[PDB]
Amino acid sequence: VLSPADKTNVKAAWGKVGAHAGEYGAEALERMFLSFPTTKTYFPHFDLSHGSAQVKGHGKKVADALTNAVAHVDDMPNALSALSDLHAHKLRVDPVNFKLLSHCLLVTLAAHLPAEFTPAVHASLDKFLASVSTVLTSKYR
Amino acid sequence: VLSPADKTNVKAAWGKVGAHAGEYGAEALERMFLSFPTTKTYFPHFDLSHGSAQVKGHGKKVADALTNAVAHVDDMPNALSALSDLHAHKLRVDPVNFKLLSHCLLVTLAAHLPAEFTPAVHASLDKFLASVSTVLTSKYR
Amino acid sequence: VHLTPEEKSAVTALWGKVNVDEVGGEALGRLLVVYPWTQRFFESFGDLSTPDAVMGNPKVKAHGKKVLGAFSDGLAHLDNLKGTFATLSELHCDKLHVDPENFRLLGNVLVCVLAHHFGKEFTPPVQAAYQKVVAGVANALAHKYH
Amino acid sequence: VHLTPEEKSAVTALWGKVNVDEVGGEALGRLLVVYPWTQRFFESFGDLSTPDAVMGNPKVKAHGKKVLGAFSDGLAHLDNLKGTFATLSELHCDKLHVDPENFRLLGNVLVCVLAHHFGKEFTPPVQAAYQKVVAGVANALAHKYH
Ligand code: HEM
Ligand code: HEM
Ligand code: HEM
Ligand code: HEM
Ligand SMILES: *Cc1c(O)cccc1OCc1cccc(CO[N+](=O)[O-])n1
Ligand SMILES: *Cc1c(O)cccc1OCc1cccc(CO[N+](=O)[O-])n1
Numbered sequence: 364v365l366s367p368a369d370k371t372n373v374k375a376a377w378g379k380v381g382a383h384a385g386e387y388g389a390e391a392l393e394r395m396f397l398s399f400p401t402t403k404t405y406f407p408h409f410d411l412s413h414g415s416a417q418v419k420g421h422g423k424k425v426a427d428a429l430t431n432a433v434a435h436v437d438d439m440p441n442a443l444s445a446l447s448d449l450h451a452h453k454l455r456v457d458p459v460n461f462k463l464l465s466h467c468l469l470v471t472l473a474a475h476l477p478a479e480f481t482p483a484v485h486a487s488l489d490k491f492l493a494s495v496s497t498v499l500t501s502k503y504r
Numbered sequence: 505v506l507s508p509a510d511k512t513n514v515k516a517a518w519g520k521v522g523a524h525a526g527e528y529g530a531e532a533l534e535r536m537f538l539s540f541p542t543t544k545t546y547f548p549h550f551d552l553s554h555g556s557a558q559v560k561g562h563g564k565k566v567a568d569a570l571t572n573a574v575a576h577v578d579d580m581p582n583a584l585s586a587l588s589d590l591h592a593h594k595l596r597v598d599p600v601n602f603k604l605l606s607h608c609l610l611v612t613l614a615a616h617l618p619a620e621f622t623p624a625v626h627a628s629l630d631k632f633l634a635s636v637s638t639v640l641t642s643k644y645r
Numbered sequence: 646v647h648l649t650p651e652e653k654s655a656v657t658a659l660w661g662k663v664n665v666d667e668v669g670g671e672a673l674g675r676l677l678v679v680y681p682w683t684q685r686f687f688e689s690f691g692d693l694s695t696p697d698a699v700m701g702n703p704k705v706k707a708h709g710k711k712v713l714g715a716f717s718d719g720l721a722h723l724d725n726l727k728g729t730f731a732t733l734s735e736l737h738c739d740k741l742h743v744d745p746e747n748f749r750l751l752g753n754v755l756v757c758v759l760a761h762h763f764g765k766e767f768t769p770p771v772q773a774a775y776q777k778v779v780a781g782v783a784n785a786l787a788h789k790y791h
Numbered sequence: 792v793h794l795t796p797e798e799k800s801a802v803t804a805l806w807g808k809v810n811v812d813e814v815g816g817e818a819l820g821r822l823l824v825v826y827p828w829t830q831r832f833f834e835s836f837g838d839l840s841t842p843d844a845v846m847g848n849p850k851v852k853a854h855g856k857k858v859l860g861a862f863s864d865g866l867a868h869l870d871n872l873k874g875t876f877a878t879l880s881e882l883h884c885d886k887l888h889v890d891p892e893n894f895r896l897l898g899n900v901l902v903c904v905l906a907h908h909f910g911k912e913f914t915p916p917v918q919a920a921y922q923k924v925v926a927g928v929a930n931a932l933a934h935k936y937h
Contacts, residue, residue, distance in 0.1 A: 364581050364588075364644040390915070398919040401742045440505050447505075457682040459744050466899050470918060473907040480907055482842040486825040490642070497638070501631065502681065503505040531769070538773040542888045596831040600890045607753050611772060614761040621761055623696045627679040643827055784937055791930060791937055 365490060370436050372487035376472070376479050377433045384430060387471045389422025394467040402460055432495050443498045450499040461496035468492060506631055511577050513628035517613065517620040518574050525571060528612050530563025535608035543601050570609075573636050584639045591640040602637035609633060646723050646781035652774035653723075659763060659771060660720060668762065669713030670706035672755040674699050680750055686741060716755070719782045726785035738789035745787040752779030792870050792927060798920035799869060805909070805917055806866055814908070815859030816852030818901045820845050826896055832889060862901070865928050876931040884935035891933035898925025 365373075380387055395402050396411055403411055410417045428446060435442035450456045469488060473480045506514070521528055536543050537552055537559075544552055551558045569587060576583035591597050610629060614621040648656065677684045677699050684693045690704040699705060715733060722729040737743045756775055760767040794802075823830050823845050830839045836851060838844040845851060861879060868875045883889045902921055906913040 364639055364642040366644045369644070394915045394918055397915045398922040451681070455682045455685050457685070457744060457747075459746060466902070467918075469903050470906045470913070473903050474910050474913055477907055477910060480903075482821050482824040482846055485821060485903065486842070489825050498505055500682075501505040503507045503510075535769045535772055538769045539776040545888070592827065596828045598828045598831070598890055598893075600892060607756075608772075610757055611760045611767075614757050615764050615767050618761055618764065621757075623675050623678045623700055626675060626757070627696075630679050641828065788937070791934075 365436065365487070365494060368483075369487040369490055372484045373433055373436065373491045376476070376484050376488060377430065379476055379479055380426070380430075380472075383475065384426035385419060385423025387422075387468075387475060388424070388426030388429075389419045390474075391464065391467040391471045392418055392422050392425065394470060395464050398467065399460075399463045402463060405454060405456065405460070429495070433491075436491070439494065439498050440503060443495070444504070447499050447501065447503065451502045456500060458496065458500045461492075461500060465489070465492035465496060506577065506628065506635065509624075510628035510631055513625045514577070514632045515574055517617065517625050517629060518571065520617050520620050521567070521571075521613075524616070525567035526560065526564030528563070528609075528616065529565070529567035529570075530560045532605065532609045532612045533559055533563050533566065535611055536605050539608065540601075540604045543604060546595065546597060546601070570636070574632075577632070580635065580639045581644060584636065585645070588640050588642060589645065592643045593645075597641060599637065599641050602633075602641060606630070606633035606637060646726065646777045648723065648774055648777060652770075652777075655771050656720065656774045656778065659759070659766070659775075660717070662763075663713070663759075664762070665710065665713055665717075667706075668709075668755075668758055669711070669716075670709030671700065671761075672751065672758045673709035673712055674702075674705050675754045675758065676747075676751050677705070679754065680747070683747060683750075686743065712751075716778075716782060719785070720778065723778070723781065726781050727788055730782070730785040730788070734786050734789040737786055745783070745790065748783040748786050749780070752783045755779060792872055794869055794920070794923055798923065801917050801920045802866060802869075802924055805905070805913075805921075806863070809859075809905075810908075811859050811863060812856060813852075814901075814904055815855030815857070815862075817846075817855070817907075818897065818904045819855035819858055820848075820851050821904065822897050822900045823851065825900065826893070829893060829896075832887065858897075862928065865931070866924065869924070869927075872927045872931040873934055876928065877934065880932050880935045883932055891929065891936060894929035894932045895926070898929050901925060 393413065403409075409415075409421075428443075432439065432443060440447075469485065469492075472488065473485075534554060537547075550556070550562070573580065573584065581588075610626065610633070613629065614626075677687065677693060678696050684699075687693065687705075687708075690708070691702060692698040693702065693705075715730070719726055719729055737748075756772065756779060759775065760772070823833065823839060824842050830845075833839065833851070833854075836854070837848055839848065839851075861876070865872055865875050883894075884891075902918065902925060905921065906918070
């Protein structure tokens with residue numbers, strides 16, 4: 364459950380991502396696949412080689428959905444209902460994998476935006492991604 | 505995020521508890537203190553010997569909040585606001601303890617309401633308790 | 646795991662009444678239903694599409710029976726749970742890459758099933774003795790990660 | 792106890808550049824801020840009511856330096872993480888009863904702090920090698936539960 368300040372921190376930090384959405388999205392995925400290789404088995408038909416155009420294209424989808432989630436932070440279950448169909452009903456993704464991707468996003472954000480990655484903003488982003496993760500892994504229809 | 509089915513499963517099953525609320529609350533507390541003794545460190549000022557009047561009356565307070573949480577399943581943050589300030593701001597309970605109590609509540613319901621404790625209902629109740637737990641452990645004011 | 650002599654008598658007594666044809670299947674079945682991501686490990690088991698399909702599935706019932714028999718074997722060797730489960734740990738850790746949190750979930754699902762079957766005979770001190778066992782079992786299965 | 796020769800090289804080289812006077816307090820401070828319930832374990836440390844109070848609490852920064860030294864001890868003994876941390880494992884598990892999921896959290900907070908201070912130099916390969924360091928430290932610290 365996000366406080367008003369959490370929403371303030373998330374909106375302000377993710378807005379600083381901007382045109383670097385797909386770049387940071389792709390970088391998170393590559394960290395995740397490499398730090399935690401078991402995650403690759405959710406993408407068995409993917410080209411997961413370093414720098415592959417498919418992972419770029421997929422990282423951009425992640426970040427754009429996160430952008431969408433930031434704007435609909437007070438309407439998550441409705442705004443994310445289709446992504447929950449995919450991850451919870453079809454892919455039945457284990458929730459520990461969401462912690463891994465969320466951590467890798469935080470790492471990416473800290474590597475690229477050191478001035479904005481303050482303790483308070485770090486804490487808000489973690490809860491925001493945990494909140495998005497809960498929605499994507501729960502079957503609510 | 506509960507589905508409409510989750511909500512009806514939880515109301516029907518918790519509706520059966522009726523007047524056993526305080527008995528079942530106390531039993532679930534006793535189950536948690538016996539099985540997971542470190543949970544006691546949150547109640548150092550309590551009498552925790554078995555059958556203690558203090559635990560019994562506290563069990564009743566717990567079941568009633570659950571009964572209230574069932575009736576307000578669609579606005580938990582407003583309804584649970586006071587208990588969240590207690591458990592997240594003042595007490596700072598480690599989330600693993602909510603999983604232990606949740607599990608002891610499930611054990612209590614299965615032992616007393618075997619016909620209600622269906623695989624689907626078991627799943628909705630687990631999710632309901634995980635959702636109450638999340639609100640009580642989040643600092644969102 | 647440290648059970649008193651009085652905990653072991655009450656663990657043993659309850660276990661000897663357990664329905665070995667159903668209890669394991671109900672535990673594995675409830676795991677696949679309450680934690681749907683665990684179905685990803687059982688793709689070859691056929692229809693897991695609804696609760697009723699999962700619990701009635703004969704491959705689930707047959708696999709759950711083997712789960713129950715491993716717990717029976719851990720009960721018989723409380724003094725050496727690590728050697729008792731060494732190869733199951735290799736299978737579950739090295740080959741299947743099951744995340745250890747799932748081991749604890751199954752252990753607690755089993756507890757819920759015992760409570761479902763035995764009602765008020767599943768007292769809190771009986772539960773307390775059973776929690777040490779499943780935590781013991783779950784720790785021995787995660788040892789190949791240790 | 793599971794690092795390839797190239798992963799040991801990468802973690803040793805980066806750690807030689809780590810400011811062991813500031814990185815520990817930064818990581819313990821962020822742990823206390825991002826995961827607020829962990830403040831309960833540091834009730835004698837004084838003011839922890841806001842992010843600024845936490846990150847400016849001199850007891851947090853002093854104790855974080857002890858944390859980081861013990862992480863340094865583990866990095867010089869990478870193939871004996873169990874023994875390097877055995878005594879801390881007794882303190883954290885038998886005396887303080889810190890749930891081991893908190894060891895994973897601090898390890899990952901530390902990973903975020905390393906990324907924060909190194910930027911582009913904390914590359915996906917450097918991170919992956921460090922992910923096995925902090926997971927081995929978490930595992931070692933949880934040994935007395937095992
Ligand atoms: C914040 C967390 C996450 C977000 C925002 C997210 C978002 C997305 C999006 C936007 C898509 C594309 C769907 C489409 O365009 O039709 C997708 C697909 C997918 N995601 Fe995620 N996801 C997250 C976490 C995860 C994790 C942790 C995993 C697995 C480790 C995962 C596994 C998959 C898979 C397998 C697909 C299907 C790709 C394919 O087969 O074509 N997701 N996700
Ligand atoms: C999981 C659902 C939980 C619910 C529904 C719940 C509900 C309640 C309620 C209704 C009260 C009394 C509020 C009042 O005094 O007016 C309370 C107090 C308290 N809770 Fe919980 N709680 C939960 C979880 C936990 C857990 C997991 C722990 C620790 C292991 C915990 C520790 C405490 C303590 C220490 C108190 C103070 C009791 C006193 O001194 O009077 N709670 N909770
Ligand atoms: C924690 C207690 C557990 C026990 C005691 C247990 C026991 C067993 C046993 C006896 C087997 C049969 C191996 C053989 O006969 O060669 C097995 C296989 C297997 N286990 Fe478990 N298990 C546990 C947890 C889990 C969990 C949580 C998962 C997944 C979420 C899992 C996934 C599997 C799979 C996929 C197989 C192979 C089934 C097949 O393809 O035939 N195990 N386990
Ligand atoms: C995972 C890596 C961790 C490492 C390497 C570590 C290391 C240490 C060290 C070296 C000490 C000092 C021991 C002494 O001087 O006697 C200490 C004390 C302590 N640790 Fe940790 N720790 C870790 C995780 C945690 C976590 C996650 C928590 C709680 C959330 C925690 C709670 C404490 C407390 C309360 C103390 C005693 C502080 C005091 O003196 O009041 N530790 N730790
Ligand atoms: C709030 C929270 C926290 O703190 C940690 C994990 C998960 C959550 O929330 C999950 C959740 C459920 C339902 C809705 C939402 C947000 O959607 N809104 O628009 O409110 N989050
Ligand atoms: C939804 C969910 C699941 O599935 C598992 C754990 C936690 C949660 O969410 C808890 C939560 C967070 C924020 C709000 C609410 C209630 O939202 N409604 O008002 O419905 N629940």
